[PDB]
Amino acid sequence: GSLTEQDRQLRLLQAQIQRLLEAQSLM
Amino acid sequence: GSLTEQDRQLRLLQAQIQRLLEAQSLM
């Protein structure tokens, strides 16, 4: 539960949102 | 942009949200 880990998982979340939106032709 | 791909990226998004929330001690 470190900030190191939270920060990593948040950035990976941001990437994965983008990946979905690109697959949807929205980004 | 297939549904195959959207469905995959959506499920990966769901997993990654969960991963963040577990790192945050919220799940």
Residue numbers in the entry:
A (entry chain A), B (entry chain A): 2 to 3, 726 to 750
Text of the article:
characterise this difference, we sought to solve the structure of the HsCCD. coiled-coil dimer of dimers generated by crystallographic symmetry. as an antiparallel dimer of dimers. dimeric form we observe in our structure. concentration and varies between dimeric to nearly tetrameric. reached that of a tetramer at higher concentrations (4000 µM). which is involved in both the dimerisation and PB3 interfaces. and binding to PB3 are likely mutually exclusive. that can readily dissociate to interact with PB3.
PLK4, and this interaction targets STIL to centrioles. allows homo-multimerisation, the interaction with the PB3 domain of PLK4, or both. structures and interactions of CCDs and PLK4-PB3s in humans and flies. STIL/Ana2, which can then interact with and recruit Sas-6.
